[PDB]
Amino acid sequence: TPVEEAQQKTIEAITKAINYMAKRRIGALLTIERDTGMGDYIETGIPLNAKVSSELLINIFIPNTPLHDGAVIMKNNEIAAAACYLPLSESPFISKELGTRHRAAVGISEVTDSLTIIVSEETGGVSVAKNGDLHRELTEEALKEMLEAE
Amino acid sequence: TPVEEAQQKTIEAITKAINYMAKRRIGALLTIERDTGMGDYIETGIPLNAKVSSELLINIFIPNTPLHDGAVIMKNNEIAAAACYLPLSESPFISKELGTRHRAAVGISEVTDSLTIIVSEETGGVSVAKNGDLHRELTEEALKEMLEAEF
Numbered sequence: 001t002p003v004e005e006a007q008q009k010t011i012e013a014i015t016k017a018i019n020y021m022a023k024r025r026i027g028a029l030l031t032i033e034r035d036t037g038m039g040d041y042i043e044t045g046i047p048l049n050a051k052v053s054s055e056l057l058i059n060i061f062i063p064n065t066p067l068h069d070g071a072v073i074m075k076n077n078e079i080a081a082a083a084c085y086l087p088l089s090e091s092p093f094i095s096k097e098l099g100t101r102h103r104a105a106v107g108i109s110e111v112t113d114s115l116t117i118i119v120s121e122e123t124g125g126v127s128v129a130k131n132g133d134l135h136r137e138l139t140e141e142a143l144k145e146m147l148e149a150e
Numbered sequence: 151t152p153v154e155e156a157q158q159k160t161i162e163a164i165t166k167a168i169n170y171m172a173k174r175r176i177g178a179l180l181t182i183e184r185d186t187g188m189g190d191y192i193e194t195g196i197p198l199n200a201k202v203s204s205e206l207l208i209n210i211f212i213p214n215t216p217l218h219d220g221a222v223i224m225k226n227n228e229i230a231a232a233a234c235y236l237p238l239s240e241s242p243f244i245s246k247e248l249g250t251r252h253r254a255a256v257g258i259s260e261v262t263d264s265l266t267i268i269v270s271e272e273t274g275g276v277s278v279a280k281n282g283d284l285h286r287e288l289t290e291e292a293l294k295e296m297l298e299a300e301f
């Protein structure tokens with residue numbers, strides 16, 4: 001169906017962008033809004049309401065640029081805003097070598113049903129936060145399975 | 151009016167981005183669609199249909215990134231697409247030292263009523279192409295007045 005084709009196109013755009021950033025160890029923080037509304041967090045960032053593309057996702061997270069610090073929040077198959085604030089988790093069960101992007105991802109996942117993807121600037125490792133837990137060191141196939149399951 | 155206020159915000163976003171890129175010698179090519187529709191050229195790029203911000207404009211043109219090569223085309227208060235093709239002018243009144251961004255800007259200005267802004271990656275100089283003419287070495291005040299008059 002059109003809706004199904006659109007969802008797969010967006011998943012492919014996300015995975016292509018994450019692949020690029022993982023290879024270059026570009027830190028990234030990408031939250032996909034689900035049933036819990038995140039308007040309050042979207043409003044803290046720079047409004048985009050942009051079509052998804054791998055190219056735009058990559059350009060947003062280039063280090064030392066206006067849009068790279070903070071989270072991209074996606075909603076309704078669009079990039080709603082970039083450089084958004086997310087709450088930092090206080091969970092004592094996050095690996096202590098991880099920094100602010102990972103704690104922000106877990107934090108939003110504790111108060112919403114959203115799915116957040118994180119790329120580590122230290123290792124290029126890819127992780128996903130959902131329901132208060134962080135799933136670390138994902139392969140490309142694992143990330144795709146999570147996005148399709150979501 | 152809201153329309154006028156939105157126009158003022160878009161102009162401020164553009165000028166802030168252009169000033170940032172000029173200072174850092176970030177090459178940029180930004181065409182503002184006017185009454186001649188530019189859909190044929192918009193469709194050659196990556197669709198964004200994004201709200202304008204100085205931050206997004208800057209992020210688009212960072213060198214060596216997916217979106218930096220080609221023109222950004224704006225439709226009113228939106229960035230319609232990035233990395234768009236524009237036709238190259240063969241006008242003899244384009245300074246010989248200038249490269250493809252300036253020739254593309256003059257080229258689209260010959261077949262549309264659009265206004266195109268160019269930042270030179272060589273010098274940081276800012277120019278505008280309109281109606282087949284290239285106006286070089288603009289001050290910040292001159293660019294803002296051109297944009298305000300264009301709206």
Ligand SMILES: Cc1cc(CNCCS(C)(=O)=O)ccc1Br
Nearest residue numbers: 015018019022126138139140143
């Ligand atoms: C999610 C994902 C993961 C990878 C694997 N990264 C490799 C890092 S390594 C071999 O140094 O440990 C690639 C693309 C995507 Br998309």
Ligand SMILES: Cc1cc(CNCCS(C)(=O)=O)ccc1Br
Nearest residue numbers: 169172273274275276289290293
């Ligand atoms: C249009 C504009 C012009 C300037 C003047 N910069 C001229 C000096 S340069 C970059 O060539 O070394 C500043 C801001 C805006 Br906005």
Ligand SMILES: [Mg+2]
Nearest residue numbers: 285286287288
């Ligand atoms: Mg002069």
